[PDB]
């Protein structure tokens, strides 16, 4: 199944953070309604933050993620989480090997914010 | 119920991020093992991370986040999700104040890393 798209509420501002645990360097592509609106790129096996920026929604809501290594894409795996009705937790993992620990890029989607 | 309060697989390096939406100066602890073994603080109303850090989980798994504002705890919720059986998330928010909207604090542990 299609993973890394999020329906997030229309215009409404959220964070995007992405982590690395790989010796590869990854390059996370964030796209609001199909257009790149944040891309991070980074190398660390020790899990550093490679980026992290406040988005909005659009009128859409579309928001998807895409990771890449050196050209080649990650497979991703993906959740979203609501707390208390009102929390919201969109979560991606990726792949860019064999050992499938599926951590070398992490990215989390968070709203509301403020 | 308890929440922000998770056990992980022992001796195991874990992530853990703190992001901040409020007024109000966050104070996020996070204890192994009953113990402190990091401490965030700082202030933002867009999403600015307060602090990250890698963390050993030790030999009892147990990992609590706290969260405090002008010396009085927040209120908390939180839950882990664990993707393809193998990446995992422990995600906690918290609410400082009257709106309930849970994103004061925000903090994130992810894990295995590397
Ligand atoms: C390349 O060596 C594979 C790659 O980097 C490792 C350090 C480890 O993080 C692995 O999961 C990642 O796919
Ligand atoms: C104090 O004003 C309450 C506090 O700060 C606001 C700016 C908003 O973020 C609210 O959620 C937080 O509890
Ligand atoms: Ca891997
Ligand atoms: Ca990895
Ligand atoms: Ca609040
Ligand atoms: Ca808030």
């Known amino acids: 199944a299609t993973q890394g798209?999020?329906?997030?509420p229309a215009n409404t501002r959220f964070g995007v953070t992405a982590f690395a645990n790989s010796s590869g360097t990854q390059t996370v592509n964030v796209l609001v309604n199909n257009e790149?609106?944040?891309?991070?790129?980074?190398?660390?096996?020790?899990?550093?933050?490679?980026?992290?920026?406040?988005?909005?929604?659009?009128?859409?809501?579309?928001?998807?993620?895409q990771v890449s290594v050196?050209?080649?894409?990650?497979?991703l795996v993906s959740?979203?989480?609501i707390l208390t009705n009102?929390?919201?937790?969109?979560?991606?993992?990726?792949?860019?090997?064999?050992?499938?620990?599926?951590?070398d890029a992490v990215v989390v989607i968070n709203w509301p914010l403020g």
């Open 36 to 65: 790149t609106a944040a891309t991070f790129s980074g190398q660390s096996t020790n899990n550093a933050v490679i980026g992290t920026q406040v988005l909005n929604s659009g009128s859409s809501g579309k928001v998807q993620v």
């Open 86 to 103: 009102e929390l919201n937790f969109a979560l991606v993992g990726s792949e860019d090997g064999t050992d499938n620990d599926y951590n």
């Open 79 to 81: 959740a979203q989480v």
């Open 5 to 8: 798209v999020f329906t997030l």
């Open 70 to 75: 050196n050209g080649r894409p990650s497979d």
